[PDB]
A paper describes a structure:
Three well-characterized heme peroxidases (cytochrome c peroxidase = CCP, ascorbate peroxidase = APX, and Leishmania major peroxidase = LMP) all have a Trp residue tucked under the heme stacked against the proximal His heme ligand. The reaction of peroxidases with H2O2 to give Compound I results in the oxidation of this Trp to a cationic radical in CCP and LMP but not in APX. Considerable experimental data indicate that the local electrostatic environment controls whether this Trp or the porphyrin is oxidized in Compound I. Attempts have been made to place the differences between these peroxidases on a quantitative basis using computational methods. APX, like HRP, has a cation bound about 8 Å from the active site Trp while CCP has no cation leading to the suggestion that the additional nearby positive charge destabilizes a cationic Trp radical.
In addition, we have solved the crystal structure of an APX triple mutant that has previously been shown to enhance Trp radical stabilization. Pea and soybean APX share 95% sequence identity with identical active sites so we used the soybean APX3M structure to model the mutations into pea APX. The main reason we solved the APX3M structure rather than simply model in the mutations is the uncertainty of how to position the [name] mutant side chain. In APX, Gln204 extends out toward the surface while in CCP and LMP the Met points in toward the interior and helps to seal off the redox active Trp from solvent. Our initial computational studies showed that the results changed significantly depending on how Met204 is positioned which provided the motivation for solving the APX3M structure. The three engineered Met residues in APX3M are positioned just as they are in CCP and LMP and we made the safe assumption that these three Met residues will be positioned the same in pea APX. While the addition of these Met residues into APX increases stability of the cationic Trp radical the effect is much less dramatic (rows 7, 10, 11). APX, of course, retains the K+ site which indicates that the Met residues cannot overcome the destabilizing effects of the K+ ion.
Residue numbers in the entry: 2 to 249
The structure:
């Protein structure tokens, strides 16, 4: 039930020009994974029952960057600040979600539809809504389902975002990439999850919880066998995530 707001022609022109500048900047800086993490941690605080949190620009606030789950995302905010200043008409909320969409595209992933119009909100949500990497399937459903309002399919598809990037012992404490090509958006996260622990690669307990759940596991198997189906479900889930609490 989405009803996207009207924005001026000047706003739309800035969206299009920022999208191109973000492509070049994110590719040059090699920061696609960090920008995807920034957009996801912006959006993933949404609570459907209270309509609080969500992708409304609050992740730039020092109070929210200080949340433990956001360790290292101040690097991403600082990286984007000069470019954001070239587009004063855009909300921070739209700019960070656009950066996440671009991060997926420039690494070869699907083209996630983007609609402008998010307004920046004044207060960050309370800490503690983002998922815990040491927990399992029940926790995943509490966070993605009971709070955000996403489906079990969305959970598995979105966790394929770990197909790009790595953990860092100085940030979360976990260390290493999920896949052998961590700047290439493909279905290798599911390939590695199924194949078992390879040396040099890393999987979180929350990743491994997908394998034993009766709903998540068929989805893992489908995405490992069919990258096209992963790309379709990923783009659907990323769009929903980026629009939580927005336009209904
Ligand atoms: C659902 C449970 C999830 C958990 C428990 C989780 C946890 C983590 C952790 C612990 C890290 C390592 C941070 C660090 O040490 O640098 C990380 C990185 C990352 N996460 Fe997730 N995450 C989840 C879902 C997602 C989703 C839904 C997305 C996006 C669609 C995502 C995108 C990323 C990316 C791209 C990185 C790599 C960042 C980099 O390379 O600097 N994650 N995640
Ligand atoms: K990959």
């Amino acid at each position: 039930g989405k009803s996207y707001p009207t924005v001026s022609a000047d706003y739309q022109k800035a969206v299009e020009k920022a999208k191109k500048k973000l492509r070049g900047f994110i590719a040059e800086k090699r920061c696609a994974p960090l920008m995807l993490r920034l957009a996801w941690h912006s959006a993933g605080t949404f609570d459907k029952g209270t309509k609080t949190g969500g992708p409304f620009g609050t992740i730039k606030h020092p109070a929210e960057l200080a949340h433990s789950a956001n360790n290292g995302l101040d690097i991403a905010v600082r990286l984007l600040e000069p470019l954001k200043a070239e587009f004063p008409i855009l909300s921070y909320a739209d700019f960070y979600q656009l950066a996440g969409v671009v991060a997926v595209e420039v690494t070869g992933g699907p083209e996630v539809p983007f609609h402008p119009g998010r307004e920046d909100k004044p207060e960050p949500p309370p800490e503690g809504r983002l998922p815990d990497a040491t927990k399992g399937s029940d926790h995943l459903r509490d966070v993605f389902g009971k709070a955000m309002g996403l489906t079990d399919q969305d959970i598995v598809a979105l966790m394929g975002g770990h197909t790009i990037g790595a953990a860092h012992k100085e940030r979360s404490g976990f260390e290493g990439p999920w896949t052998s090509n961590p700047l290439i958006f493909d279905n290798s996260y599911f390939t590695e999850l199924l194949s078992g622990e390879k040396e040099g690669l890393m999987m979180l307990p929350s990743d491994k919880a997908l394998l034993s759940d009766p709903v998540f596991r068929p989805l893992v198997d489908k995405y490992a066998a069919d990258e096209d189906a992963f790309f379709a479900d990923y783009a659907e889930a990323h769009q929903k995530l980026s629009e939580l609490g927005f336009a209904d």
